[PDB]
Design a binder for this molecule. Structure first.
Ligand SMILES: Cc1cn([C@H]2C[C@H](O)[C@@H](COP(=O)(O)OP(=O)(O)OP(=O)(O)O)O2)c(=O)[nH]c1=O
Ligand SMILES: [Mg+2]
Ligand SMILES: [Mg+2]
Ligand SMILES: [Mg+2]
Length: 341
DNA sequence: GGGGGAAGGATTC
DNA sequence: ACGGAATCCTTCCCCC
Protein backbone atom coordinates (compact mmCIF):
# COMPACT_ATOMS: atom_id res chain seq x y z
CA UNK A 1 0.00 0.00 0.00
CA UNK A 2 1.32 3.41 -1.16
CA UNK A 3 -0.33 6.78 -0.34
CA UNK A 4 -0.09 10.02 -2.38
CA UNK A 5 -1.72 12.78 -0.30
CA UNK A 6 -2.48 16.31 -1.56
CA UNK A 7 -2.89 19.68 0.27
CA UNK A 8 -4.19 22.65 -1.73
CA UNK A 9 -1.94 25.50 -0.65
CA UNK A 10 -3.29 28.59 1.12
CA UNK A 11 -6.36 27.58 -0.83
CA UNK A 12 -8.79 30.42 -0.13
CA UNK A 13 -5.95 32.90 -0.47
CA UNK A 14 -4.65 31.25 -3.62
CA UNK A 15 -8.02 30.88 -5.35
CA UNK A 16 -8.46 34.66 -5.17
CA UNK A 17 -4.96 34.98 -6.73
CA UNK A 18 -6.18 32.86 -9.64
CA UNK A 19 -9.29 35.04 -9.82
CA UNK A 20 -7.07 38.10 -10.27
CA UNK A 21 -3.34 37.31 -10.62
CA UNK A 22 -2.60 40.95 -9.79
CA UNK A 23 -2.34 39.51 -6.29
CA UNK A 24 0.12 36.67 -6.96
CA UNK A 25 3.15 38.47 -5.61
CA UNK A 26 1.41 40.48 -2.91
CA UNK A 27 0.34 39.62 0.69
CA UNK A 28 -3.24 38.43 0.82
CA UNK A 29 -5.57 38.13 3.80
CA UNK A 30 -8.98 36.56 3.32
CA UNK A 31 -11.33 37.40 6.17
CA UNK A 32 -14.88 37.37 7.51
CA UNK A 33 -15.78 40.87 8.71
CA UNK A 34 -18.26 40.59 11.58
CA UNK A 35 -19.81 43.95 10.72
CA UNK A 36 -19.92 45.33 14.27
CA UNK A 37 -17.30 48.03 13.87
CA UNK A 38 -15.16 49.03 10.87
CA UNK A 39 -12.65 46.23 10.19
CA UNK A 40 -14.03 43.98 12.95
CA UNK A 41 -13.97 40.23 12.41
CA UNK A 42 -11.12 37.78 11.80
CA UNK A 43 -8.65 36.43 9.23
CA UNK A 44 -9.81 33.30 7.39
CA UNK A 45 -6.44 32.54 5.78
CA UNK A 46 -3.35 34.31 4.46
CA UNK A 47 -0.86 33.47 1.71
CA UNK A 48 2.86 33.15 2.33
CA UNK A 49 3.55 36.80 1.80
CA UNK A 50 1.10 37.73 4.56
CA UNK A 51 1.82 34.70 6.69
CA UNK A 52 5.58 35.20 6.48
CA UNK A 53 4.92 38.14 8.84
CA UNK A 54 2.59 36.78 11.51
CA UNK A 55 -0.73 37.12 9.72
CA UNK A 56 -2.54 33.83 10.19
CA UNK A 57 -6.17 32.88 10.67
CA UNK A 58 -8.15 33.42 13.84
CA UNK A 59 -6.29 36.62 14.65
CA UNK A 60 -8.28 39.84 14.57
CA UNK A 61 -8.28 41.72 11.28
CA UNK A 62 -7.35 44.88 13.19
CA UNK A 63 -4.22 43.26 14.60
CA UNK A 64 -3.50 42.26 11.02
CA UNK A 65 -3.84 45.75 9.56
CA UNK A 66 -1.41 46.61 12.35
CA UNK A 67 1.37 44.32 11.11
CA UNK A 68 0.73 44.52 7.36
CA UNK A 69 -1.30 47.73 6.84
CA UNK A 70 -0.81 47.57 3.07
CA UNK A 71 -2.02 44.03 2.43
CA UNK A 72 -4.97 43.17 0.23
CA UNK A 73 -7.97 42.50 2.42
CA UNK A 74 -10.68 40.47 0.70
CA UNK A 75 -13.84 39.11 2.23
CA UNK A 76 -14.17 35.36 2.04
CA UNK A 77 -16.24 33.64 -0.66
CA UNK A 78 -16.72 29.95 0.18
CA UNK A 79 -18.90 28.93 -2.80
CA UNK A 80 -16.23 29.84 -5.34
CA UNK A 81 -13.43 28.16 -3.35
CA UNK A 82 -15.82 25.24 -3.08
CA UNK A 83 -16.20 24.72 -6.83
CA UNK A 84 -12.55 25.45 -7.68
CA UNK A 85 -12.09 22.53 -5.30
CA UNK A 86 -14.54 20.17 -6.92
CA UNK A 87 -13.13 20.93 -10.36
CA UNK A 88 -9.77 19.88 -8.89
CA UNK A 89 -10.98 16.93 -6.81
CA UNK A 90 -12.66 15.30 -9.84
CA UNK A 91 -9.31 15.89 -11.52
CA UNK A 92 -7.73 13.54 -8.97
CA UNK A 93 -10.21 10.70 -9.17
CA UNK A 94 -8.89 9.92 -12.66
CA UNK A 95 -5.95 8.55 -10.67
CA UNK A 96 -7.95 6.20 -8.39
CA UNK A 97 -11.70 5.84 -7.77
CA UNK A 98 -10.72 5.15 -4.18
CA UNK A 99 -9.61 8.58 -3.03
CA UNK A 100 -10.40 10.17 0.32
CA UNK A 101 -11.61 13.75 0.42
CA UNK A 102 -10.65 14.86 3.93
CA UNK A 103 -11.06 18.61 3.65
CA UNK A 104 -11.65 21.13 0.90
CA UNK A 105 -7.87 21.35 0.43
CA UNK A 106 -7.17 17.66 1.08
CA UNK A 107 -7.62 14.45 -0.83
CA UNK A 108 -6.41 10.94 -0.06
CA UNK A 109 -5.36 8.36 -2.65
CA UNK A 110 -3.81 4.88 -2.78
CA UNK A 111 -1.91 4.47 -6.05
CA UNK A 112 -0.79 1.02 -4.79
CA UNK A 113 -1.70 -0.14 -8.29
CA UNK A 114 -0.80 2.80 -10.48
CA UNK A 115 2.53 2.95 -8.65
CA UNK A 116 4.50 0.27 -6.84
CA UNK A 117 7.97 1.34 -5.62
CA UNK A 118 8.66 4.97 -4.54
CA UNK A 119 10.68 6.79 -7.21
CA UNK A 120 7.66 5.77 -9.29
CA UNK A 121 5.31 7.37 -6.75
CA UNK A 122 7.51 10.46 -6.66
CA UNK A 123 6.65 10.96 -10.33
CA UNK A 124 2.90 10.40 -10.12
CA UNK A 125 3.61 13.29 -7.77
CA UNK A 126 4.93 15.88 -10.21
CA UNK A 127 2.36 14.60 -12.71
CA UNK A 128 -0.71 15.16 -10.51
CA UNK A 129 1.16 18.18 -9.16
CA UNK A 130 1.99 19.61 -12.59
CA UNK A 131 -1.51 19.00 -13.97
CA UNK A 132 -3.68 20.54 -11.23
CA UNK A 133 -1.05 23.25 -11.69
CA UNK A 134 -2.05 23.68 -15.34
CA UNK A 135 -5.82 23.17 -15.25
CA UNK A 136 -6.99 25.33 -12.36
CA UNK A 137 -3.71 27.20 -12.06
CA UNK A 138 -3.55 25.93 -8.46
CA UNK A 139 -0.26 24.71 -6.94
CA UNK A 140 -0.45 21.92 -4.35
CA UNK A 141 1.91 20.03 -2.10
CA UNK A 142 2.28 16.28 -2.44
CA UNK A 143 3.18 13.87 0.33
CA UNK A 144 4.32 10.29 -0.12
CA UNK A 145 4.68 7.49 2.42
CA UNK A 146 3.26 4.23 3.89
CA UNK A 147 -0.01 5.49 5.44
CA UNK A 148 -2.31 8.53 5.36
CA UNK A 149 -0.71 10.08 8.47
CA UNK A 150 2.92 10.16 7.35
CA UNK A 151 1.51 11.45 4.10
CA UNK A 152 0.35 14.63 5.85
CA UNK A 153 3.66 15.00 7.60
CA UNK A 154 5.11 14.57 4.16
CA UNK A 155 3.22 17.45 2.59
CA UNK A 156 3.52 19.28 5.92
CA UNK A 157 7.33 19.38 5.94
CA UNK A 158 7.58 20.26 2.27
CA UNK A 159 4.63 22.60 1.55
CA UNK A 160 3.88 24.86 -0.21
CA UNK A 161 4.39 23.95 -3.90
CA UNK A 162 6.71 21.31 -2.57
CA UNK A 163 7.02 17.55 -2.67
CA UNK A 164 8.49 14.86 -0.44
CA UNK A 165 8.46 11.11 0.05
CA UNK A 166 9.07 9.15 3.28
CA UNK A 167 10.67 5.75 2.58
CA UNK A 168 9.50 3.11 5.04
CA UNK A 169 12.97 3.59 6.52
CA UNK A 170 12.05 7.20 7.33
CA UNK A 171 8.65 6.30 8.85
CA UNK A 172 11.01 4.95 11.49
CA UNK A 173 13.51 7.80 11.94
CA UNK A 174 10.70 10.26 12.54
CA UNK A 175 8.85 8.03 14.98
CA UNK A 176 11.69 8.88 17.36
CA UNK A 177 12.57 12.34 15.98
CA UNK A 178 9.22 14.07 15.25
CA UNK A 179 7.74 16.19 18.08
CA UNK A 180 4.26 15.03 19.11
CA UNK A 181 2.47 18.28 18.22
CA UNK A 182 3.39 18.03 14.52
CA UNK A 183 1.41 14.79 14.56
CA UNK A 184 -1.89 14.90 12.58
CA UNK A 185 -4.76 14.92 15.04
CA UNK A 186 -2.63 16.72 17.55
CA UNK A 187 -3.60 20.27 18.36
CA UNK A 188 -2.26 22.38 21.22
CA UNK A 189 -4.80 21.22 23.80
CA UNK A 190 -3.69 17.65 23.23
CA UNK A 191 0.00 18.33 22.64
CA UNK A 192 0.06 19.48 26.26
CA UNK A 193 -1.69 16.79 28.25
CA UNK A 194 0.77 14.56 26.43
CA UNK A 195 3.78 16.68 27.45
CA UNK A 196 2.39 16.55 31.00
CA UNK A 197 2.53 12.78 30.89
CA UNK A 198 6.07 13.24 29.71
CA UNK A 199 5.67 12.44 26.02
CA UNK A 200 7.22 14.53 23.25
CA UNK A 201 8.43 12.51 20.27
CA UNK A 202 6.02 10.00 18.73
CA UNK A 203 7.56 6.76 20.05
CA UNK A 204 7.42 8.07 23.60
CA UNK A 205 3.71 7.03 23.67
CA UNK A 206 4.54 3.52 24.86
CA UNK A 207 6.59 4.58 27.88
CA UNK A 208 3.68 5.94 29.92
CA UNK A 209 0.89 3.64 31.17
CA UNK A 210 -1.97 2.98 28.72
CA UNK A 211 -4.62 3.90 31.28
CA UNK A 212 -2.51 7.03 31.70
CA UNK A 213 -3.33 7.84 28.06
CA UNK A 214 -7.02 6.89 28.02
CA UNK A 215 -7.86 9.26 30.85
CA UNK A 216 -5.88 12.18 29.49
CA UNK A 217 -6.56 11.99 25.76
CA UNK A 218 -9.38 9.49 25.37
CA UNK A 219 -8.80 5.96 24.11
CA UNK A 220 -9.42 6.60 20.44
CA UNK A 221 -6.45 8.94 20.55
CA UNK A 222 -4.44 6.56 22.71
CA UNK A 223 -4.83 3.59 20.36
CA UNK A 224 -4.14 6.03 17.57
CA UNK A 225 -0.79 7.34 18.82
CA UNK A 226 0.19 3.88 20.10
CA UNK A 227 -0.35 2.43 16.62
CA UNK A 228 1.73 4.89 14.59
CA UNK A 229 4.45 4.40 17.17
CA UNK A 230 4.67 0.72 16.21
CA UNK A 231 4.79 1.46 12.44
CA UNK A 232 1.59 -0.64 12.34
CA UNK A 233 -1.13 2.00 11.87
CA UNK A 234 -1.88 1.19 8.19
CA UNK A 235 -5.46 2.35 7.58
CA UNK A 236 -7.65 2.24 4.43
CA UNK A 237 -8.44 5.24 2.28
CA UNK A 238 -12.16 5.97 2.47
CA UNK A 239 -14.27 8.09 0.19
CA UNK A 240 -15.68 9.84 3.35
CA UNK A 241 -18.88 11.96 3.61
CA UNK A 242 -19.86 15.31 5.16
CA UNK A 243 -22.36 14.48 7.87
CA UNK A 244 -23.49 17.84 9.18
CA UNK A 245 -24.04 21.36 7.85
CA UNK A 246 -24.54 24.76 9.41
CA UNK A 247 -24.08 28.51 9.45
CA UNK A 248 -23.05 30.71 12.38
CA UNK A 249 -23.87 34.38 11.91
CA UNK A 250 -22.46 37.30 13.92
CA UNK A 251 -24.59 39.66 16.08
CA UNK A 252 -24.15 43.30 15.18
CA UNK A 253 -23.99 43.70 18.97
CA UNK A 254 -24.36 41.24 21.84
CA UNK A 255 -27.99 40.28 22.43
CA UNK A 256 -29.77 38.29 25.12
CA UNK A 257 -33.23 39.26 23.86
CA UNK A 258 -34.96 36.43 21.97
CA UNK A 259 -36.09 38.87 19.24
CA UNK A 260 -32.86 40.66 18.40
CA UNK A 261 -31.51 37.13 17.98
CA UNK A 262 -34.37 35.69 15.90
CA UNK A 263 -33.55 37.62 12.69
CA UNK A 264 -30.09 36.03 12.93
CA UNK A 265 -31.17 32.46 13.68
CA UNK A 266 -33.29 32.53 10.54
CA UNK A 267 -30.54 33.89 8.27
CA UNK A 268 -28.70 30.85 9.68
CA UNK A 269 -31.45 28.37 8.80
CA UNK A 270 -31.93 29.66 5.27
CA UNK A 271 -28.15 29.75 4.83
CA UNK A 272 -28.17 26.10 5.88
CA UNK A 273 -31.16 24.88 3.98
CA UNK A 274 -29.61 26.28 0.87
CA UNK A 275 -26.24 24.63 1.63
CA UNK A 276 -28.21 21.53 2.71
CA UNK A 277 -29.81 21.28 -0.72
CA UNK A 278 -31.56 17.91 -1.08
CA UNK A 279 -30.58 16.55 2.35
CA UNK A 280 -33.13 15.75 5.02
CA UNK A 281 -31.69 16.36 8.53
CA UNK A 282 -33.37 14.15 11.15
CA UNK A 283 -31.52 16.11 13.83
CA UNK A 284 -30.99 19.82 14.55
CA UNK A 285 -28.85 21.82 16.96
CA UNK A 286 -28.55 25.49 17.84
CA UNK A 287 -25.14 26.90 18.64
CA UNK A 288 -24.72 30.17 20.51
CA UNK A 289 -21.42 31.83 21.47
CA UNK A 290 -21.49 33.38 24.94
CA UNK A 291 -20.00 36.88 24.95
CA UNK A 292 -16.88 35.87 26.85
CA UNK A 293 -16.41 33.55 23.90
CA UNK A 294 -17.71 30.32 25.41
CA UNK A 295 -19.91 27.94 23.42
CA UNK A 296 -23.17 26.34 24.46
CA UNK A 297 -25.43 24.47 22.06
CA UNK A 298 -28.66 22.51 22.23
CA UNK A 299 -30.17 19.89 19.97
CA UNK A 300 -32.99 17.48 19.21
CA UNK A 301 -33.39 14.52 16.90
CA UNK A 302 -36.72 13.69 15.26
CA UNK A 303 -38.10 10.35 13.95
CA UNK A 304 -38.37 12.00 10.54
CA UNK A 305 -36.73 14.67 8.40
CA UNK A 306 -36.89 18.37 9.23
CA UNK A 307 -39.14 20.59 7.10
CA UNK A 308 -37.89 24.17 6.97
CA UNK A 309 -40.95 25.03 9.08
CA UNK A 310 -40.01 22.58 11.78
CA UNK A 311 -36.54 24.13 11.35
CA UNK A 312 -37.76 27.53 12.63
CA UNK A 313 -40.31 26.20 15.15
CA UNK A 314 -37.86 24.03 17.11
CA UNK A 315 -35.04 26.36 16.25
CA UNK A 316 -36.66 28.95 18.47
CA UNK A 317 -37.39 26.34 21.15
CA UNK A 318 -33.69 25.56 21.58
CA UNK A 319 -32.36 29.15 21.64
CA UNK A 320 -34.81 29.84 24.47
CA UNK A 321 -33.63 26.94 26.65
CA UNK A 322 -30.12 28.40 26.27
CA UNK A 323 -31.18 31.95 27.13
CA UNK A 324 -32.69 30.07 30.08
CA UNK A 325 -30.08 27.52 31.22
CA UNK A 326 -27.48 30.30 30.79
CA UNK A 327 -27.18 34.03 31.42
CA UNK A 328 -24.24 35.31 29.40
CA UNK A 329 -25.14 37.43 26.36
CA UNK A 330 -24.60 36.15 22.79
CA UNK A 331 -22.00 37.29 20.22
CA UNK A 332 -22.41 34.42 17.74
CA UNK A 333 -25.55 32.36 16.98
CA UNK A 334 -25.94 29.59 14.43
CA UNK A 335 -27.60 26.30 13.50
CA UNK A 336 -26.18 22.80 12.84
CA UNK A 337 -28.09 20.17 10.89
CA UNK A 338 -27.08 16.55 11.16
CA UNK A 339 -27.98 12.89 10.73
CA UNK A 340 -29.41 12.93 7.25
CA UNK A 341 -31.68 10.29 5.74
C1' DG B 1 -22.71 -4.96 32.11
C1' DG B 2 -23.57 -2.95 27.88
C1' DG B 3 -25.73 -2.13 23.56
C1' DG B 4 -28.37 1.70 21.08
C1' DG B 5 -28.46 6.24 21.29
C1' DA B 6 -29.01 11.09 22.34
C1' DA B 7 -26.75 15.38 23.92
C1' DG B 8 -23.71 18.94 25.04
C1' DG B 9 -19.28 20.33 25.52
C1' DA B 10 -14.11 19.89 23.56
C1' DT B 11 -10.67 19.95 20.39
C1' DT B 12 -8.78 20.28 15.49
C1' DC B 13 -7.96 23.16 11.80
C1' DA C 1 -9.31 42.31 18.70
C1' DC C 2 -11.11 37.10 19.45
C1' DG C 3 -14.76 34.46 12.26
C1' DG C 4 -16.27 29.70 10.77
C1' DA C 5 -17.23 24.88 9.51
C1' DA C 6 -17.14 20.05 11.21
C1' DT C 7 -16.33 16.59 13.87
C1' DC C 8 -14.36 14.38 18.15
C1' DC C 9 -15.03 12.81 23.07
C1' DT C 10 -17.28 11.94 27.47
C1' DT C 11 -21.33 11.48 29.57
C1' DC C 12 -26.61 9.97 30.78
C1' DC C 13 -30.25 7.12 29.84
C1' DC C 14 -33.30 3.53 28.53
C1' DC C 15 -34.50 -1.03 28.91
C1' DC C 16 -32.77 -5.77 28.01
C1 LIG D 1 -4.86 26.41 13.24
C2 LIG D 1 -6.12 27.11 12.75
C3 LIG D 1 -6.49 27.03 11.38
N1 LIG D 1 -7.63 27.70 10.90
C4 LIG D 1 -7.89 27.76 9.53
C5 LIG D 1 -6.73 28.63 9.03
C6 LIG D 1 -5.79 27.69 8.27
O1 LIG D 1 -5.64 28.27 6.97
C7 LIG D 1 -6.60 26.40 8.16
C8 LIG D 1 -5.68 25.19 8.33
O2 LIG D 1 -4.77 25.13 7.23
P1 LIG D 1 -3.59 24.04 7.24
O3 LIG D 1 -4.18 22.75 6.47
O4 LIG D 1 -3.11 23.75 8.61
O5 LIG D 1 -2.46 24.64 6.27
P2 LIG D 1 -2.87 24.86 4.73
O6 LIG D 1 -2.03 25.84 4.01
O7 LIG D 1 -2.88 23.39 4.08
O8 LIG D 1 -4.41 25.30 4.80
P3 LIG D 1 -4.89 26.37 3.70
O9 LIG D 1 -4.54 25.68 2.28
O10 LIG D 1 -6.31 26.77 3.81
O11 LIG D 1 -3.86 27.60 3.84
O12 LIG D 1 -7.56 26.41 9.21
C9 LIG D 1 -8.42 28.41 11.79
O13 LIG D 1 -9.41 29.01 11.38
N2 LIG D 1 -8.08 28.51 13.16
C10 LIG D 1 -6.93 27.85 13.61
O14 LIG D 1 -6.63 27.91 14.80
MG1 LIG E 1 -4.58 23.69 2.41
MG1 LIG F 1 -6.53 22.85 5.48
MG1 LIG G 1 -0.90 19.47 15.59
Amino acid sequence: MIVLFVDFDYFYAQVEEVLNPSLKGKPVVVCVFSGRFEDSGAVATANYEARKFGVKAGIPIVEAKKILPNAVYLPMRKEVYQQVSSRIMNLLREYSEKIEIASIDEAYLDISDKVRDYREAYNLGLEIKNKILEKEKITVTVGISKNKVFAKIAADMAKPNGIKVIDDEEVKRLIRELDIADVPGIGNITAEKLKKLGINKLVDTLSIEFDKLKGMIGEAKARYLISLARDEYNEPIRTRVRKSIGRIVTMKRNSRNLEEIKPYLFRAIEESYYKLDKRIPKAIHVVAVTEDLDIVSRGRTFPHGISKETAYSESVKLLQKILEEDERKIRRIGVRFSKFI
